[PDB]
Amino acid sequence: SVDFAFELRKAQDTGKIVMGARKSIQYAKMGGAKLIIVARNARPDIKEDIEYYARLSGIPVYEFEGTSVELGTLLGRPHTVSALAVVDPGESRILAL
Prior knowledge:
The chain is of the alpha+beta class. The chain has a single domain, classed as CATH 3.30.1330.30. Helices cover 43% and strands 20% of the residues. It contains four helices and four strands, in the order H-E-H-E-H-E-H-E. It has a four-stranded mixed β-sheet with strand order 1-4-2-3, sandwiched between helices. Helix 3 links the parallel strand 2 (35-39) and strand 3 (61-64). Helix 2 (21-30) packs parallel to helix 3 (44-57).
């Protein structure tokens, strides 16, 4: 079974993820990510805007059922993270989400 927290840290420390709504949206437009993850309390424009382009680009979107503050903590960051793009899963199974 897939554990979200464990696979995300593994992606972060062994693959390549980029954090932020604006960069995620940019990656979605370019077809440049294998998965986007958004926080449950990310702003609706961020959700909808990411979903708009990720759907068109064929990039799955996964909703993290926690807050952007929690998402930042998981990623060892002091600020909230409302969305991130997985460019390379690395050694993780995060794409199994």
